[PDB]
Amino acid sequence: IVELPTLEDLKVQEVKVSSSVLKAAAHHYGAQCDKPNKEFMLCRWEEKDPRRCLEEGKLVNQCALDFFRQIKRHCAEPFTEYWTCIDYSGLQLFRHCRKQQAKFDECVLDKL
Amino acid sequence: GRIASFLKNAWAKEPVLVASFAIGGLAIILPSLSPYTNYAIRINRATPYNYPVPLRDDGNMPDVPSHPQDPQGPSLEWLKNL
Amino acid sequence: MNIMLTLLTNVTLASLLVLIAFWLPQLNAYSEKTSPYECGFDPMGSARLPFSMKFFLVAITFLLFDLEIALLLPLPWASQTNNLKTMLTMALFLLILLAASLAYEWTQKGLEWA
Amino acid sequence: PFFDVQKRLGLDLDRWMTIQSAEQPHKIPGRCHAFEKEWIECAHGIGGIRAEKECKIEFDDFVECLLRQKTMKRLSAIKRQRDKLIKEGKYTPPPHHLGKEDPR
Amino acid sequence: SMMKWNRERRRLQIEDFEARIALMPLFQAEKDRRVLQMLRENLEEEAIIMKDVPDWKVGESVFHTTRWVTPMMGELYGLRTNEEILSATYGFIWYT
Amino acid sequence: MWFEILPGIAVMAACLFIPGMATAHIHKFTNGGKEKRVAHFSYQWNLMERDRRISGVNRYHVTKGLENID
Amino acid sequence: MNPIIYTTLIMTVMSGTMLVMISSHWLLIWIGFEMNLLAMIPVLMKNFNPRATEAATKYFLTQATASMMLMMAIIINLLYSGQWTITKMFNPVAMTMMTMALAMKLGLSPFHFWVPEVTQGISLQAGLLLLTWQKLAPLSVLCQISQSINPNLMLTMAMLSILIGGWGGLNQTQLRKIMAYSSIAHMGWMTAVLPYNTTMTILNLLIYITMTLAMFMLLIHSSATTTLSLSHTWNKMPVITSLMMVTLLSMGGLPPLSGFMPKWMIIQEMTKNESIIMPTLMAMTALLNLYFYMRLAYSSSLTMFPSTNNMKMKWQFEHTKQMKLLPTMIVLSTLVLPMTPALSSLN
Amino acid sequence: MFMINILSLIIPILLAVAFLTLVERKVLGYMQLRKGPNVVGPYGLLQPIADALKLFTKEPLRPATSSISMFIIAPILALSLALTMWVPLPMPYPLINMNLGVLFMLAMSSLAVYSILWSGWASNSKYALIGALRAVAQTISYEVTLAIILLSVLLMNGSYTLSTLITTQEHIWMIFTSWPLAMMWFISTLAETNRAPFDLTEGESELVSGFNVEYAAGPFAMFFMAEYANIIMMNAFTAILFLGASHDPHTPELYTINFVLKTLALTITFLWIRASYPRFRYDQLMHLLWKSFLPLTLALCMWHISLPIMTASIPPQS
Amino acid sequence: TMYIAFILSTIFVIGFVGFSSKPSPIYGGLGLIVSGGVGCGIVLNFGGSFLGLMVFLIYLGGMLVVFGYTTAMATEMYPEVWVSNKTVFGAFVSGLMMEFCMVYYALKEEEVEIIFKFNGLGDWVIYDTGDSGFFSEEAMGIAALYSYGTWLVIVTGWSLLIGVVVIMEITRGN
Amino acid sequence: MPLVYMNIIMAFAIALAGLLMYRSHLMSSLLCLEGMMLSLFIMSTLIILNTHFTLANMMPIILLVFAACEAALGLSLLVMVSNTYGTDYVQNLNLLQ
């Protein structure tokens, strides 16, 4: 008897980047994508019901997609040169790689 | 005066125990003196295991930054200089 | 799982060593050979009561320190609490009492060990 | 004689440990914080006696929050029902290889 | 030396906390949609299985409460393959 | 003389040497050079939770890169 | 054991009970009893006798199992309501056990058998303290859980404590065992009225403590123990036997005397509840309780058992180490009857 | 294939205890000027297996007076735990990433000696009972200080997980920071393992091979073997815990190549202790501990509790 | 599933069957060893690992040893094995049939009628999401004992201390 | 309530019945009591792990402490009774149950 959203209406194409790769660039991802994001979580902690904020939960997905679309056309080879360095450690520790982050962060701070 | 003298005695007799009381008390008296202690607690305010839930705008406020990184929130580079 | 597997392989290993230890030499056990050792001459009596107050008089103190260290264990994690001045006294406090307890024993001549 | 000196002096030295909510380190939620919160907000000037009447529903939902008793009797009734259909029904194919792994 | 190195490691730690703290929200979204998904699906499977029963309101919340609960991760895996359940609950602890 | 101890001791080392290697490479052998993954906390396990399902293969060793989004 | 340590023990007993009387959280109550125990055993072991040792064995063994059942029933309460505050309990199968655990802690029958024995094993100092101070804490929690008590279960032990507190009292000679059956009988009267109205309980408690302080201070003053040993005292310091008579009658609750004040408020309260039969049986048996106070009075003051000769030299020597608190403990435990209404001070 | 990893952890170590025996007679031999075993080798090397074969081949009587069940179950437990303590040990990569495996090392170490208690109880002999009892005395008496000093050296790494203990030693080594605790840890490992000056469990001349006597062939081989398991293992433990090393993740093997040195460098030292000091006697053995080690362990403990606050140097791990 | 936690509960209970029967304290010490390791395993299954290792350390690594001392002071010649008396062994069987009836009730899958209802089915069902940041609930949960709960620390300190005093004032009397 | 809890509770009931069937030398009773203690501990900890009622993570260990503490006391009394006899419950000086 509980109200539920249809199996379809929730459906959205997933972000499908792997978690290590995700983490490699997420440090910028928080810096850029933002307004939809905080709108979302603030919307969540308000009313607690997920269904209420599910739509913003879509909007954040697509926002992140646009973020990576902005990424791939520019930095990528430096980028892959970076997260490949990181995914190699199972602690995912930032300290292990770092130097590549010079490559990646510079190519972004200039080229994009 | 004379009380100092039996320190020579105990130091002659039970040195282990003497060093024990030494550092054992010193470890209690010393810490209040150190300024770094105020930083020390402060560091553990800085690190956030839990998420920082956003607050809704409601007329300026206005020290809360509205992100990106508005220079309105707490500084933390003081820590960076450490 | 993981750990239960290594437990099983270890215990089965050892038990295997036991079974190859007994069911192997295949020779003659007999009485007096199987009699308990007593540096030659036969025992004056089966083991009874090596009583000593000097056992528990300290061993109990072991038990009541071990309970204490059980409280010491949370400390490394407690160290990262947001409010150390509220903590720090206690971090010292128990240790003082630990020491204090010992100190009380130290000189009531309750610590004759041995 | 429930002396409540800790209250008169305001020491609160004991009170903190009480209750599912009541501020916990790193603000970790209780598993049943909500029903508890409602149920306590229901409980004040009503005091003890009438409280076991009027606030009963809240405490009930809180009970099921604690034990999940009824949802278990239900879920058990379903899983036991399914055996009867096991020859008459083949259940669901995806559980085995559906989009649930695509789902994230 | 221990002081220097320890402080520095505290810095890289806190930065790592910003990293995760940036990742979080969309994971919240994902787990969200995935939960409502599984709940819907299992509810439909309820509509099939329990339908034979003459008297059975389907999917009724046990509570009087209108409010959402976040289901116990028991009913949420009410019909899943045993392996999926081993992934579900013990999967962390049994993981090395 | 005393140097003659060495054959006795070196055999020790190699034996002890073996596990330290044998585990460290088996990880890489299983994980595809990913060098294992610790999961002390629920969250990191949540990352391995989000994983495996993301890879079409269930073995999560592989990390699909940017190409996955297109 | 030197006084400086003895006093720390006894003070940590006081603390170990005060803690029960303060804390609202259950865990601190179980800690209250638990700390109380450890600090209670050693004080029974002063002087130390081959007898005293097994006395303490009895006491510890029962108190330990009691505390165990109590903690179990707390945990079950938490399981079925997720709380720690005292308040109502929320599961009868647990509640009856908390009642049992406390029933051992008071020594109510049929759990009672340890109390007459333990009293035998210790000196009247440690004895008095055991029969008064130890009776506070468990009552201190029962007053807090009077709200939900299952009255049937309470009145049954409350009665049976009075019958057993009677019949086992007619039989003994040496006084300490008798004091044990006296107390084991009064606890029936305290715990009886508890479901109905706690203020009457606390009143009765105060009278009981005052009374048994009167007696044990007197037995200390004369160092009597076995009944015959008490019998000689009429010639040496006639007053104190001539005063044991009275305090005994106040135990008996002959109506002008103070000890009547408890019963006669209790009968009131229960009578508001109807329940008219129970107090009648109870009050009738309390008579049986009185009778061995009377026989004990016959050994002592009213009649002179033959003196032994050796006593004569002892006549020259005044008693010493006066116990200051005593005279007031007599007088309050006797004359106070036209000061019942003041009981409402206890609200 | 996790199973073959485990097997790969258990075979090499048993080989290591065998050759440990041989090294023991070797070095401990050359301290005595006399050469150790040699003739059967050529360098003695073949000896330990000949030794073990001599044992297992030899008849292991079931004593008439002994209860049999305890008598058999004890050795099993001895090798059991002696091996089980090895699992969570970072070399560099632990076979298991226990969140708090150090504490587990203490758990195994603490159930260890209980086997000694049974070993001497079921053995029924007078020497068995007396020696076993004093054995348990010394052991526990050292586990308390043991676990406290281990705590105090763990306040600063951050947390009970072991791998992090590598990370916290990426430079200076722990030892320069708190060597005196390293001393007490060393000696506590020198007694908990029941070794040279703290020799009593074996008793030796004092009690003709102590608790271990009535055990004959195989079970004796088990207690003997397990004993050496604990010795090399506490040695390795001390090594990782007080002596850090450079660690490139890309070449883990390099690290291990270093590690076995740093631990072997410890084990040899016990032998070079064995050749040096007369045993304590059961009074003094416990005297120096309760009277002398312990109070320093406490004072040092408060001190180490207090440095991170005064120095504002609190370790990262949550 | 495996029901492994539950079967551990079963071995636990028989651990108390052989333990609560009273056949020389030493074998009972074995009983608490078995029940001890089973215990720490069971609590480990919910992941409160630190606690399970407390009991596996503080209890079994402490207690049963000191009991391995009391028997040196008690023993008496010819201690009895479980099989060594009709009432002891009778008792052990007496436990086994009961607990087995409980397992049969688990086969019945019906809610238990004894004492109060036992809801049945597998253990996993009650679990909920354990989601958290880089810290276990337990860690800070017990770490709270010092900073956030000083009162208990006070009374425990005081209690253990004066317990040492009590041990003195009992043993010294002799 | 899930069956496991019922099982532990039953282990308590046996850990009590064993204490009270109570026979021969009493050292067995200190064992049975400690077993009882352990069952209460485990039954508590499973709960505090259940609802993530985090503060109470402190209790079980504290519980354990005092409980172990009293047992630690108990042996001492046994010593004394062992001191005059070589222990057995069968011998008690006191009269009137």
Curated annotation (Swiss-Prot), chain G:
Chief place where the protein resides: mitochondrion
Recorded catalytic activity of this chain's protein: a ubiquinone + NADH + 5 H(+)(in) = a ubiquinol + NAD(+) + 4 H(+)(out)
Organism: Sus scrofa
Pfam families: NADH_dehy_S2_C (PF06444), Proton_antipo_M (PF00361)
Keyword Cell division: no
The name this protein goes by in its record: NADH-ubiquinone oxidoreductase chain 2
GO biological process: mitochondrial electron transport, NADH to ubiquinone; mitochondrial respiratory chain complex I assembly; reactive oxygen species metabolic process
Gene Ontology MF annotations: NADH dehydrogenase (ubiquinone) activity
Keywords, in A-Z order: Electron transport, Membrane, Mitochondrion, Mitochondrion inner membrane, NAD, Respiratory chain, Translocase, Transmembrane, Transmembrane helix, Transport, Ubiquinone
Subunit structure: Core subunit of respiratory chain NADH dehydrogenase (Complex I) which is composed of 45 different subunits. Interacts with TMEM242.
Membrane topology: Multi-pass membrane protein
Gene that encodes it: MT-ND2
Cell location: Mitochondrion inner membrane
GO CC annotations, alphabetized: mitochondrial inner membrane; respiratory chain complex I
Purpose of the protein: Core subunit of the mitochondrial membrane respiratory chain NADH dehydrogenase (Complex I) which catalyzes electron transfer from NADH through the respiratory chain, using ubiquinone as an electron acceptor. Essential for the catalytic activity and assembly of complex I.
E.C. number: 7.1.1.2
Keyword Protein transport recorded: no
The protein's enzyme class: translocase
From Swiss-Prot, chain H:
Domain of life the protein comes from: Eukaryota
Entry EC no(s): 7.1.1.2
Alphabetical UniProt keywords: Electron transport, Membrane, Mitochondrion, Mitochondrion inner membrane, NAD, Respiratory chain, Translocase, Transmembrane, Transmembrane helix, Transport, Ubiquinone
Transmembrane segments: 2-22, 68-88, 100-120, 146-166, 171-191, 223-243, 253-273, 294-314
Record's subcellular location: Mitochondrion inner membrane
Single annotated GO MF: NADH dehydrogenase (ubiquinone) activity
Subcellular location, principal: mitochondrion
Subunit comment: Core subunit of respiratory chain NADH dehydrogenase (Complex I) which is composed of 45 different subunits.
PANTHER family from the UniProt entry: NADH DEHYDROGENASE SUBUNIT 1, NADH-UBIQUINONE OXIDOREDUCTASE CHAIN 1
UniProt protein name: NADH-ubiquinone oxidoreductase chain 1
Lineage: Eukaryota, Metazoa, Chordata, Craniata, Vertebrata
Name of the coding gene: MT-ND1
Curated annotation (Swiss-Prot), chain I:
UniProt GO BP: mitochondrial electron transport, NADH to ubiquinone; mitochondrial respiratory chain complex I assembly
Name used for this protein in its record: NADH-ubiquinone oxidoreductase chain 6
Gene field: MT-ND6
Quaternary structure and interacting proteins, as annotated: Core subunit of respiratory chain NADH dehydrogenase (Complex I) which is composed of 45 different subunits.
Topological type in the membrane: Multi-pass membrane protein
EC number(s) stated in the UniProt entry for this protein: 7.1.1.2
Transmembrane segments: 1-20, 24-44, 46-66, 87-107, 148-168
Entry keyword NAD: yes
Reactions accelerated catalytically: a ubiquinone + NADH + 5 H(+)(in) = a ubiquinol + NAD(+) + 4 H(+)(out)
Organism listed in the record: Sus scrofa
Gene3D superfamilies in the record: NADH-ubiquinone/plastoquinone oxidoreductase chain 6, subunit NuoJ
Pfam families: Oxidored_q3 (PF00499)
Gene Ontology CC annotations of this record: mitochondrial inner membrane; mitochondrion; respiratory chain complex I
Curated annotation (Swiss-Prot), chain J:
EC top class, as a word: translocase
Membrane topology: Multi-pass membrane protein
The reaction(s) this protein catalyses: a ubiquinone + NADH + 5 H(+)(in) = a ubiquinol + NAD(+) + 4 H(+)(out)
Taxonomy, superkingdom: Eukaryota
Keywords: Electron transport, Membrane, Mitochondrion, Mitochondrion inner membrane, NAD, Respiratory chain, Translocase, Transmembrane, Transmembrane helix, Transport, Ubiquinone
Stated role: Core subunit of the mitochondrial membrane respiratory chain NADH dehydrogenase (Complex I) which catalyzes electron transfer from NADH through the respiratory chain, using ubiquinone as an electron acceptor. Part of the enzyme membrane arm which is embedded in the lipid bilayer and involved in proton translocation.
Subunit structure: Core subunit of respiratory chain NADH dehydrogenase (Complex I) which is composed of 45 different subunits.
Protein name in the entry: NADH-ubiquinone oxidoreductase chain 4L
Organism placement in taxonomy: Eukaryota, Metazoa, Chordata, Craniata, Vertebrata
